[PDB]
């Protein structure tokens, strides 16, 4: 239980603010994007010979969607807005995918090893179906397990994402200084909360483990950008993501 000065307090109030206003709840709106029926009917996958298309077109639509809210979210960031444009762009491009998995891990069911986004339940065979290579699939669920196991309170989630966003190493940033400091600001403010663990059912090097995962999100953002290309016609559907991953 360490302090959180007058500023760290305000920081976390805007994070969750624009965050509740665009994310963390959007997972329930997934159904509103043409979701194949077997996503409702958990007691059975997609019949071997059912067309794949309906599922894929659903993927794309919800994929493009999350990103649309990873943006809507950042637009309610006085500081993010504060930055120039060649930079605002490059930051999203480097962390939009990374961030989706961040918030998406909160719908992960460690028990069933599935995502539960309202009345929907996604599995790794679904990924397989969409076309994602088995190996990228293994690696992807492994990450999410790791992440979910830490039981990071809500604010511990909203901050982790902030760090992924504000990264100076991103290719394309011009205010590398004004950004590196913001990153530093975020990185510290999180360090605060972690120590104040009211209940200690977790590790001591929780933070140090997270940073390894931010590097996993790096390893992962790059592996995904390639996957939506190996998958014929998938790229073509979500042009937004094509840009983010250009």
């Amino acid at each position: 239980p360490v302090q959180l000065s007058k500023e760290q307090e305000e920081l976390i109030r805007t994070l969750l603010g624009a965050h509740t206003r665009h994310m963390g709840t959007m997972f329930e709106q997934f159904v509103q994007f043409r979701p194949p029926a077997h996503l409702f009917i958990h007691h059975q996958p997609l019949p071997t010979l059912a067309p794949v298309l309906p599922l894929v077109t659903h993927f794309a639509d919800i994929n493009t969607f999350m990103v649309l809210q990873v943006i809507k979210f950042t637009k309610d960031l006085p500081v993010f807005r504060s930055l120039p444009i060649e930079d605002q762009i490059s930051l999203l491009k480097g962390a939009a995918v990374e961030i989706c998995h961040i918030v998406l891990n909160t719908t992960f069911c460690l028990q069933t090893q599935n995502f539960l986004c309202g009345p929907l339940r996604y599995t790794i065979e679904d990924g397989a179906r969409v076309g994602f290579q088995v190996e990228f699939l293994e690696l992807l669920f492994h990450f999410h397990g790791t992440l979910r196991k830490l039981q990071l309170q809500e604010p511990e989630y909203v901050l982790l994402a902030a760090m992924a966003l504000f990264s100076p190493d991103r290719p394309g940033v011009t205010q590398r200084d004004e950004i590196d400091q913001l990153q530093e600001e975020m990185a510290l403010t999180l360090q605060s909360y972690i120590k104040g663990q009211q209940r200690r059912p977790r590790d001591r090097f929780l933070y140090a483990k997270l940073l390894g995962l931010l590097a996993e999100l790096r390893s992962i953002n790059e592996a995904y950008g390639y996957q939506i290309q190996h998958i014929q016609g998938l790229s073509a559907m979500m042009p937004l993501l094509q840009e983010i991953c250009s």
């Binding site: 649309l68 943006i71 444009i85 762009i89």
Partner: peptide, 12 residues
């Protein structure tokens, strides 16, 4: 180049 992205940032 980044047509739709530029598109989305401009404002609220």
């Amino acid at each position: 180049r980044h047509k739709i992205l530029h598109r989305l940032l401009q404002e609220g």
